[PDB]
From Swiss-Prot, chains A, B:
The family this protein is said to belong to: Belongs to the CD3Z/FCER1G family.
Protein name: T-cell surface glycoprotein CD3 zeta chain
Organism: Homo sapiens (Human)
Gene name of the record: CD247
Tissue specificity field: CD3Z is expressed in normal lymphoid tissue and in peripheral blood mononuclear cells (PBMCs).
Shown part of the complete sequence: 28 to 60 of 164
Residues with the Phosphoserine modification: S31
Subunit-level organization: The TCR-CD3 complex is composed of a CD3D/CD3E and a CD3G/CD3E heterodimers that preferentially associate with TCRalpha and TCRbeta, respectively, to form TCRalpha/CD3E/CD3G and TCRbeta/CD3G/CD3E trimers. In turn, the hexamer interacts with CD3Z homodimer to form the TCR-CD3 complex. Alternatively, TCRalpha and TCRbeta can be replaced by TCRgamma and TCRdelta. Interacts with SLA. Interacts with TRAT1. Interacts with DOCK2. Interacts with SLA2. Interacts with SHB. Interacts with ZAP70. Interacts (tyrosine phosphorylated) with SHC1 (via SH2 domain). Interacts with PTPRC.
GO-annotated cellular components: alpha-beta T cell receptor complex; cytoplasm; Fc-gamma receptor III complex; gamma-delta T cell receptor complex; Golgi apparatus; plasma membrane; T cell receptor complex
Task of the protein: Part of the TCR-CD3 complex present on T-lymphocyte cell surface that plays an essential role in adaptive immune response. When antigen presenting cells (APCs) activate T-cell receptor (TCR), TCR-mediated signals are transmitted across the cell membrane by the CD3 chains CD3D, CD3E, CD3G and CD3Z. All CD3 chains contain immunoreceptor tyrosine-based activation motifs (ITAMs) in their cytoplasmic domain. Upon TCR engagement, these motifs become phosphorylated by Src family protein tyrosine kinases LCK and FYN, resulting in the activation of downstream signaling pathways.
Length: 33, 33
């Protein structure tokens, strides 16, 4: 059907990467990466 | 064969909720024993 669904997964997917990055960043006190 | 996209959004959506929950938990220290 329309590729609109590809847009919803894009935001939710990117959100998981950005949210996971902050989680790992805080997990390590060095926060070097 | 229908609402297939609903399955992808469900997994990605739940992933954002489970990650956000662990993120806020780390922000707030554990309550006193």
């Amino acid at each position: 059907d329309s590729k609109l669904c590809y847009l919803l997964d894009g935001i939710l997917f990117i959100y998981g990467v950005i949210l996971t990055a902050l989680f790992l960043r805080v997990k390590f006190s060095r926060s070097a990466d």
